[PDB]
Design a protein around this nucleic acid. Structure first.
Lengths: 146, 48
RNA sequence: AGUCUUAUACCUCGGCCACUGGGCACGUAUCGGUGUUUGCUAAGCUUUCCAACUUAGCUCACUGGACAUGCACUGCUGACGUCGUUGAUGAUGUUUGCCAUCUAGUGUAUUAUAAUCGCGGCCUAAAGGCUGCCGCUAGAAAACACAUCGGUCUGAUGGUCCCAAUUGAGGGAGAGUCUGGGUUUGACACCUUUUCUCGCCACCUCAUGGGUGUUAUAUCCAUCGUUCCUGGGGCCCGCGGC
RNA sequence: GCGUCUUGCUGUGGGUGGUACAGCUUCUUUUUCCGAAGCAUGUAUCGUAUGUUUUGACACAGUAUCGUUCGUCGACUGUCCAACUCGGUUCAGAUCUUAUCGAACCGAAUAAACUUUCAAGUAUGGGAAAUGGUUUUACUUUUGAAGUAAUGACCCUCCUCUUACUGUCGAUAGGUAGAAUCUUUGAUCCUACCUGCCGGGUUUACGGAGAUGAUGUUAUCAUCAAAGCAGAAGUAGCCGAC
RNA sequence: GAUCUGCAACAAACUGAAGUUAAUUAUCGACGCUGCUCAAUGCAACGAAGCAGUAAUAGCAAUAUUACGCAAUGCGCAUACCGUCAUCUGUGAAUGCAUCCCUGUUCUUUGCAAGGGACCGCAGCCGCCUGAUUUCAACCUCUUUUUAUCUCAAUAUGUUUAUGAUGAUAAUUGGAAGAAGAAACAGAUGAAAUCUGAUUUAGCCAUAACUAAGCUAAAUAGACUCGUUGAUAAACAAUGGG
């Protein structure tokens, strides 16, 4: 009975600890991204003697760039990110394990502010889906598909 | 409750107030878990 | 006239009145039980006749309970080294641990001062605005006095970024106008009140139609829904009284 | 379809071995004079090991709690990192603000990015991995304790992918098991293993009393197996340390 | 160093000697051989006499007995275990959701998505037995006509009386499983059933002293379920009166 009186303090303290862990982790894992698209044209010279209706070859590549960062601080989202220690094995008797777990969690969650920095990366991608048509000018029957 | 528990000195009232705390925070944790699970299904239904 | 005590006054008038933390005592709504008489309520013996006594209790006192008051007052909480022992603990110096607040409103003064304007910091640099502490008023017996079974069940729709018709409604703001109130004299002028009008007033809410954004947002808004309160006419159910 | 002994369930019922003690009666004795015999009934008992006067009682001295991680020696190291600092303690002393400076110490910190390498050193899995054995089923149904299987599985066995875990020596340190020599009945030597200590079920294996079936031999061949050791287990308390 | 307050250390000596020497007292090894120890107690293994518990008796002695002592044994006694039942606690499989671990090797016309294993947490099928029981018919049967119960009805008689049965239940002729029990066959309890002295009485003994300490017998009273069985006394729910 005396040991089962534990719920009084262990249940809500653990619940609030998980609450603060969630409210920091959700903001900490933002994974921000930024991207943009353009439709810049690509020109390829066409020899004039080829007698083509169009003088310049035009390509329209889907140009995509994206740069993104992470910005993670110096902390321990690792092993400390564990489910309730009692779980379903409350039958094992202990009093020091819970206090050790709580003080370890407290010191970990206190020691994060020292460092906060991370890396980034950027991409440059092109997509081509250009199906162009050219006519041999003065000869509409003759035609070329690219 | 610990305001009264701090200075009671009578075992009967002490144990009765401990029983009151037991029942009250038991109801608190029960309604806590019920609310959490019902909002879990609530979000599932909203997503669906 | 002198002494003592109680009561008022008298400084306090329990540490606060925001809490009698507890004890003490008398006082008391008083209530039960006894000691209970001069006399008495009704009855009765010994039965023509109650015209001669007693019985259950009543005055008062005591006992137990309850309420209230003030305080000469006092506490509540026990562990260190212990001491010879006592079975548990009787003592030694020790220190820690209390009922002891929150909320709402208000705040000087002087003045020509960047001189402030209860005390102090922020923004803008003006005829300033925001905030921390303290002072003065009210609520919160919350706090110490004070609450005591478990388990189960107990609302939806759309919007919230921009644009278009002001398309319609409602509400706010302004401009005037009028009725009255306040300073001034006789006023004006200013402040304030009421009626009405007005609208390129990109004011707010709702109603309509679109698009934008993913980083539109409400800890909300609006509508309906259940329950409760007020006035109930009445019948579906429907009795009693007149 | 019918009748039948036996067998397995004792299915049903009945009777039966009892011993000891308690108690009753009888004879002798001073009717249980300290002895003997019979007897109704009741209780207990018809298991192992332990203790049998280590069974019990009196005196002397001593006997705190909880929760921790560890514990044959020494060597590079199989193995701990920010090693040159952090925080504190103390102090020969100095500047004299309560303050500052300096020195020693303490707790954290040097191994290498582990060891290992006959490739599961030790565990995990898969194989269109076969043999043989075992365990089911089917068929013939007759075989010499009958036979056959394109049988469901297990074991054996060979090959093979990830992951986990781990050096040795001097100890003739202590112990354990085997073997031999001498003999004290113990000692010596060698080999192999273990050491925080000494403690429970299960899992695998070992030898192995006795027993069982067969065969030509108290002899042999096959089967079971008592008690015991060893790999993980899984749990005390033993001192020391906090 | 306060510096006309004193303190600390240097362990050679000093009364008080903490160890041994110098002296006294008491004890034992007094035999030490392989060897004499942490300074003393202490011998796998070394040497002789006598018998291999002590004492006495008839007896050198064996031999037989006694008194003490030692050793062993016995459910005789108890202890741990299981053997043993009883009562009770306890009645089972496949299905999903949620957590953790590992994985570009054909990852990829958006640089960030897709796969495999684990057990816990949360939801999903139905029966069963046990605890112990309700289902069905009393519908040919007149001298060899089952009983009992829940029960009715006409007629005759101006009594105080006389007759006729359907449905169901039981004395278990038969079965489900239910009144109590979601993860199966295991745990828990019991192996008891009395005692007082502490009440009175009666009897014995004069008592340490007093004649009656003390003791013995009957009854009252008190402590007393070990789990299972049932009811009862009280509070809890009980609307009151004329």
């Amino acid at each position: 009975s005396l040991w089962l009186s534990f719920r009084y303090e262990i249940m809500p303290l653990y619940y609030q600890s998980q609450d603060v862990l969630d409210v920091i982790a959700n903001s900490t894992s933002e994974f921000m991204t930024s991207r943009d698209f353009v439709a810049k044209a690509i020109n390829i010279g066409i020899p004039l003697e080829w007698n083509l209706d169009q003088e310049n070859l035009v390509s329209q590549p889907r140009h995509n760039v994206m740069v993104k960062s992470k910005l993670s601080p110096e902390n321990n989202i690792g092993k400390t990110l564990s489910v309730n220690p009692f779980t379903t094995a409350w039958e094992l008797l202990t009093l020091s394990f819970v206090v050790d777990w709580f003080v370890n969690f407290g010191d970990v969650i206190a020691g994060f502010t020292g460092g906060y920095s991370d890396d980034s990366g950027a991409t440059a991608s092109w997509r081509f889906d250009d199906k162009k048509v050219f006519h041999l000018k003065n000869i509409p029957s003759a035609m070329v598909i690219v | 409750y610990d305001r009264k528990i701090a200075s009671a000195r009578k075992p009967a009232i002490i144990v009765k107030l401990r029983q009151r705390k037991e029942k009250a925070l038991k109801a608190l944790d029960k309604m806590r878990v019920r609310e959490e699970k019902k909002m879990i299904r609530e979000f599932a239904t909203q997503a669906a």
